[PDB]
């Protein structure tokens, strides 16, 4: 188990760690989060009591360093920082635990939720989408735009998701126009899987990261990416059977975890009706179809 200490909590803030969250009051004695499971990526995220706008947070992996949180009153936000002095750090963490000023990552043992949402998400791939190589953790917030959005302004603060466009030369082989547009299998399997992602686990991990960024920060371009990557699979007549079964599982847990009040902005009606009912894969997402019908029949 790992620990992310906080130097202090100078302003009232709702703090999230993975799918959990806690309210912390202005200058409340709060010094971090303990018992964080090693082995998975994690995200620690924030919403100021004074500005329900901007949710922001930090993707990290405890195996890559000792990370802590410190409020910056000039920039006005909680910042993640790395402590390179391992001794100094064990000393802070131990003292704060001794003083019991830390919340415990509250994992029910039965629960594989976070595992299921992050199975294929790798910190190294995250750092390629959120490019900031001087840090080992990645900042994301509600307003960050994606690369594909920028093409339709500051590239340093962009989400470099893999660009998918169904009406592009990349997706359409000359002379197979009709075939490739209606049956995206070539685009998925040769262009994206074999070409760009190399395998389905990178593809799935970007899909998953995109979802989680839409869910935790309401990041609109991430939601667009999540839907595009689902659509590309569902609109392909020829998908490896292992990907379909794993996609059904992936989506099931994403639909299960979504806040019910956000179903209207986070789920694209057209994409889901086509995936579940029109597309080549209508009959291949049994678990996703079942949870979407019993939880969001209105949307369909």
């Amino acid at each position: 188990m790992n620990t992310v200490p906080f130097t202090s909590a100078p302003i009232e803030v709702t703090i999230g760690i993975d799918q959990y969250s806690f309210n912390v009051k202005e200058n409340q004695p709060f010094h971090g989060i303990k018992d964080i499971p090693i082995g998975h990526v994690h995200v620690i995220h924030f919403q100021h009591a004074d500005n329900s706008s901007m949710r922001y947070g930090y993707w990290f992996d405890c195996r890559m360093g000792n990370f802590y949180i410190q409020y910056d009153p000039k920039d006005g936000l909680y910042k993640m920082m790395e402590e390179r002095d391992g001794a100094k750090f064990e000393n802070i963490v131990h003292n704060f635990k001794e003083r019991q000023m830390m919340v415990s990552y509250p994992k029910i043992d039965e629960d594989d939720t976070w595992y299921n949402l992050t199975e294929f998400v790798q910190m190294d791939k995250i750092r390629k989408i959120v490019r900031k190589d001087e840090n080992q953790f990645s900042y994301v917030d509600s307003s960050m735009t994606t690369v594909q959005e920028n093409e339709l302004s500051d590239p340093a603060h962009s989400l470099n998701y893999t660009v998918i466009n169904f009406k592009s030369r990349e997706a359409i082989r000359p002379g197979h126009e009709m075939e490739d547009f209606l049956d995206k299998s070539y685009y998925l399997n040769t262009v994206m899987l074999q070409g760009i992602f190399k395998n389905s686990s990178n593809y799935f991990g970007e899909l998953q990261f995109a979802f989680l960024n839409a869910m935790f920060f309401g990041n609109y371009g991430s939601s667009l990416q999540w839907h595009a990557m689902i659509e590309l699979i569902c609109s392909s007549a020829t998908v490896p059977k292992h990907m379909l079964d794993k996609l059904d599982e992936i989506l099931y847990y994403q639909i299960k975890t979504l806040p019910e009040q956000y179903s209207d902005i986070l789920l694209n009606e057209r994409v889901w009706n086509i995936c579940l009912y029109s597309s080549f894969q209508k009959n291949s997402l049994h678990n996703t179809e079942k949870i979407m019908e019993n939880k969001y029949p209105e949307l369909l």
Binding site: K167, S168, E177, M178, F181
Partner: protein, 237 residues
Amino acid sequence: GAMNSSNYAELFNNDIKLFVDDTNVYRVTVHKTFEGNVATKAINGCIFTLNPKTGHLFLKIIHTSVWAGQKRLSQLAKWKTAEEVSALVRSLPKEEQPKQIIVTRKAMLDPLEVHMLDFPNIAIRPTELRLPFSAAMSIDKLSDVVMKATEPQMVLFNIYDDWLDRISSYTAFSRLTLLLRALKTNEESAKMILLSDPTITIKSYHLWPSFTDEQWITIESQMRDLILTEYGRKYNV
């Protein structure tokens, strides 16, 4: 953006543009089989591609052979239309390629757009107008060349005959759509109006009769009257 009554006059500016109508591409007759089931039989069709400013008509004849052994023919027809329109653009010298292509039915957008990916700078646009170009096959000489064709074939026409020698494209287009509207709504009576007088003939290189300016006025009024009569009949108004 979509084309409607507001931005109607953009058609007659000097940006080259084409209308594409696909309504006559895939044409069938329906009949009963020996066992009493229903079956379709296709007949020759055509793509109706039209420069509204100059009247040049690029009539691509679609021979039934293109459907041989294909499924989902009504969908395929949209893609064949786009394939053929893209090839026409590719065959035109650069300075003649259109800056915009306006499809008369929204279902053509995606197929044309995919076929035109090589021409990112040609805008593919829908329209809200209810253009009567389906009636083109009520024009005897156009119907004739389509039905006689034994192979895929492109035939060029000027759909305005020599009208532009005397009227503007705005007026020519309005006459043309009035005429086609009439043909669409009641072909028999429209054709009666155009040909009732045997002393006004059709030049061999023309599609309509050589009316004088005054006789066009009478005709256009007679077509108007036809259209409104049929509208009353339709809606019991």
